Ligand binder design. Sequence first.
Ligand SMILES: Nc1ccc2c(NCCc3ccccc3)nc(-c3ccccc3)nc2c1
Ligand SMILES: Nc1ccc2c(NCCc3ccccc3)nc(-c3ccccc3)nc2c1
Length: 336
Amino acid sequence: ERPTFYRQELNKTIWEVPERYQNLSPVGSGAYGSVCAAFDTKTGLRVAVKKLSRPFQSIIHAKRTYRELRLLKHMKHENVIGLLDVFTPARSLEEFNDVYLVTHLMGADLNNIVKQKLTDDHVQFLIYQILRGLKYIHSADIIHRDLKPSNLAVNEDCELKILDVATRWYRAPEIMLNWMHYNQTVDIWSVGCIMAELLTGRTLFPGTDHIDQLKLILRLVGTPGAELLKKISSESARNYIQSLTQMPKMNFANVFIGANPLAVDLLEKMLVLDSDKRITAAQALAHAYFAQYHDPDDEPVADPYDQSFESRDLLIDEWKSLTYDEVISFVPPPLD
Ligand SMILES: Nc1ccc2c(NCCc3ccccc3)nc(-c3ccccc3)nc2c1
Ligand SMILES: Nc1ccc2c(NCCc3ccccc3)nc(-c3ccccc3)nc2c1
């Protein structure tokens, strides 16, 4: 049962979509693709339809498209963005050019509430959901790597989704230092930064560049111990650190003053410089700060995610075809 498509131009771009999606309203664009709000006549839900910009321009782009399609197809959890549909107007591989992704429409992102400073209880729920999302994603051996308020969608219900304001502000220091072997807890660092911003109303580490980013972080967290330097493989990294003016750790209680002690303690456990000691998503969920939300029965892990393709050097048409297969094999999620 192949659907019937109709065309239309919105802001310099042709959209060919299945009749099922109606009233396409442009709501944004970037170099990755553009998005319209739509009414899905099949489910009666408001959706976002994304049209990938230039999906198969180069090997880099084609391998990006396939990766985006693969991640979205895998995500099946209430606190992570998922895929209601994916389609193409093409009737065969040979004419396959365009990729459209469909997803629930979301009310606003986390800035559209940040810019205002939330009550403690809202902070609990918001950060709860992010961690609950993170546990899932991390369980699948996937790292977000770019968590920040603009990548978090929030309803008027305060229901939060992790989606696919400078990035650098929320980057774990070991990414700033260019470490190749960072773990999942780079996301926990970002959660820490986002959490601190919801409590105080202010960006914790609003650095002008990477050097400055490091200066501000170290001002709160202190210069590394014996034990941390003991574990840096990189000679220049190691000497930069020693090079710098030894900052002592701040007492977080003296920084986020007025904030909930249980909040200050989770921040302590999230914003540790040494990512080996940093609290994990699973562990953070069981922290008492989320006493009123935590439920180990209702914090599911994910199916394993096959990442073997990342190591594959293939041709554009090959990525193109693999993508084509992922388009075809999509099974829509079971309805409301
Ligand atoms: N970091 C972001 C920021 C904004 C985005 C955006 N914006 C449209 C409004 C919307 C916001 C939140 C949820 C749905 C819609 N749409 C999409 C998207 C759409 C369809 C398929 C895959 C991805 N991703 C976004 C990722
Ligand atoms: N077990 C670990 C644990 C943490 C690590 C870490 N994280 C802190 C980075 C940092 C510390 C102090 C000030 C700014 C940033 N960085 C590095 C590292 C960095 C660069 C090149 C090679 C390796 N290795 C780590 C090995």
